[PDB]
Amino acid sequence: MKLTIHEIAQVVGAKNDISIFEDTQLEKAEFDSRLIGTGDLFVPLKGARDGHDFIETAFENGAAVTLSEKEVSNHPYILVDDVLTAFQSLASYYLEKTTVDVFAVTGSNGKTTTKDMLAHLLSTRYKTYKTQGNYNNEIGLPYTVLHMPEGTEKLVLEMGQDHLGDIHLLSELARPKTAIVTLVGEAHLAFFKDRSEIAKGKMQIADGMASGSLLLAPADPIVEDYLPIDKKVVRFGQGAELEITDLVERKDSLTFKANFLEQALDLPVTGKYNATNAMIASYVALQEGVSEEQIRLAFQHLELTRNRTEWKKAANGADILSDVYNANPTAMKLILETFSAIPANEGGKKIAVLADMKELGDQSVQLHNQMILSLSPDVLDIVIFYGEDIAQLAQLASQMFPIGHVYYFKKTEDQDQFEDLVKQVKESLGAHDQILLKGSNSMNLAKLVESLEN
Numbered sequence: 001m002k003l004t005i006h007e008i009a010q011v012v013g014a015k016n017d018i019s020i021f022e023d024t025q026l027e028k029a030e031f032d033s034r035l036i037g038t039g040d041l042f043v044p045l046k047g048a049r050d051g052h053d054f055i056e057t058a059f060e061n062g063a064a065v066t067l068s069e070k071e072v073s074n075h076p077y078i079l080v081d082d083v084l085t086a087f088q089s090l091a092s093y094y095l096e097k098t099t100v101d102v103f104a105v106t107g108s109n110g111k112t113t114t115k116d117m118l119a120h121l122l123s124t125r126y127k128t129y130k131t132q133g134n135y136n137n138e139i140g141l142p143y144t145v146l147h148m149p150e151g152t153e154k155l156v157l158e159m160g161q162d163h164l165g166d167i168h169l170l171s172e173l174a175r176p177k178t179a180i181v182t183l184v185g186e187a188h189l190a191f192f193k194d195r196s197e198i199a200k201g202k203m204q205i206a207d208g209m210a211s212g213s214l215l216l217a218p219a220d221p222i223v224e225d226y227l228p229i230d231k232k233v234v235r236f237g238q239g240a241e242l243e244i245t246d247l248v249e250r251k252d253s254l255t256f257k258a259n260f261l262e263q264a265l266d267l268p269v270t271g272k273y274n275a276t277n278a279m280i281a282s283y284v285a286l287q288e289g290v291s292e293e294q295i296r297l298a299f300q301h302l303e304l305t306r307n308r309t310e311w312k313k314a315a316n317g318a319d320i321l322s323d324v325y326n327a328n329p330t331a332m333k334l335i336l337e338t339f340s341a342i343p344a345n346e347g348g349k350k351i352a353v354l355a356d357m358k359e360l361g362d363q364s365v366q367l368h369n370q371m372i373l374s375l376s377p378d379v380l381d382i383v384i385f386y387g388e389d390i391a392q393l394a395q396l397a398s399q400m401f402p403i404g405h406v407y408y409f410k411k412t413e414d415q416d417q418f419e420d421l422v423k424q425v426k427e428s429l430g431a432h433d434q435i436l437l438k439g440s441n442s443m444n445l446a447k448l449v450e451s452l453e454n
């Protein structure tokens with residue numbers, strides 16, 4: 001991260017006199033104080049708590065400077081109207097400074113996303129960096145940019161949306177050289193009206209691109225009204241310019257042929273969508289001087305990530321939302337908010353299962369308690385709590401919810417009511433229910449999610 005204090009202040013329109021402080025070359029930028037090391041930039045954001053509360057901890061951990069919306073006594077600080085806007089301005093600047101080629105991709109559906117496939121193909125030739133996990137939003141994307149290893153030649157940025165316009169912002173921020181749009185399987189759509197509005201939002205990905213730049217978009221007509229006018233658009237799907245003409249899905253792998261490729265590709269995954277993802281990633285990689293042979297060998301060893309978190313089904317028909325990514329309090333708040341904003345299926349309830357977050361140190365109990373502000377008796381019919389640090393939150397919810405709408409199960413260094421928790425979830429979960437599970441990744445949460453799926 002080639003950045004100094006005065007340079008950031010310049011870039012973000014610092015409102016304080018920065019010359020008071022040394023112009024130190026910075027190390028990395030973090031919004032999670034646990035990740036701060038010597039020489040870092042702290043970025044205090046509105047999370048489950050406002051990151052301003054953790055500025056002192058950041059400096060104890062070695063931060064050299066912090067962005068801030070208020071004066072910070074006894075520490076170097078960069079005073080701005082809004083930290084996140086500053087963060088985003090900084091990432092956009094960093095892209096201008098490094099002039100890295102940016103590849104923007106939407107839509108993350110399973111265990112081998114277009115973002116991961118594309119980065120993997122570009123890596124054959126180029127120092128390539130990419131969005132890690134699900135860091136694809138107004139916070140994750142700027143973080144990704146600022147974490148790009150010095151010398152990177154190609155940067156693959158996934159861009160997600162929760163509300164229409166989210167992708168416009170990210171595209172205008174990143175100014176992609178090239179973009180890919182894929183459509184997924186909504187199930188239920190949270191803050192989006194219908195499939196058209198979904199497609200509208202995804203096609204904003206081309207908003208920040210220069211005329212004549214390449215955009216891959218599906219053949220599906222839902223995107224038609226939203227096609228850019230001044231980009232080079234290439235469609236993919238049955239009948240379109242890019243097309244899969246043959247496909248064998250085996251045991252645990254798949255072989256397929258794309259019209260524009262000389263030979264079949266082999267992938268060590270299953271599913272239609274993956275062949276499509278492979279195909280469109282391949283096309284772009286070809287445009288970047290990667291050979292078909294390089295692409296074929298590359299796919300012989302492709303990474304599977306965690307299943308990019310979404311909905312599953314229990315074997316009784318219920319809708320499971322298991323959120324494995326990001327075991328931190330803000331991610332807990334946020335998934336609570338998202339899950340809560342989904343309407344319940346006709347005939348069904350909404351159940352949340354919450355377990356202890358880990359590595360919150362001395363602050364663990366209070367940060368769990370903080371989730372009370374994200375729990376609403378109106379939308380959540382049953383909240384079930386599992387762990388030890390989460391006990392006080394369970395108590396708070398039991399006071400704030402109707403009689404009988406909360407359950408707590410103990411998990412300590414000795415006692416463990418996992419067995420009871422499982423029974424209770426099974427008894428409470430109807431065929432038309434929605435159930436959210438969120439905690440750290442434990443063997444038990446994993447055993448639970450599995451007793452439902454089975």
Ligand SMILES: N#Cc1c(NC(=O)c2cc(S(=O)(=O)N3CCOCC3)c(Cl)cc2Cl)sc2c1CCN(Cc1ccc(-c3nn[nH]n3)cc1)C2
Binds near residue numbers: 033034140359362
């Ligand atoms: N709120 C909050 C906290 C965090 N929030 C995040 O990591 C975070 C996580 C997310 S996110 O949802 O995970 N996100 C990632 C980016 O892509 C989008 C999805 C987002 Cl959008 C935003 C934030 Cl700000 S991480 C974290 C917190 C609270 C405190 N933490 C550890 C800690 C422990 C002890 C002390 C302490 N205080 N006094 N003595 N010790 C201070 C901090 C770690």
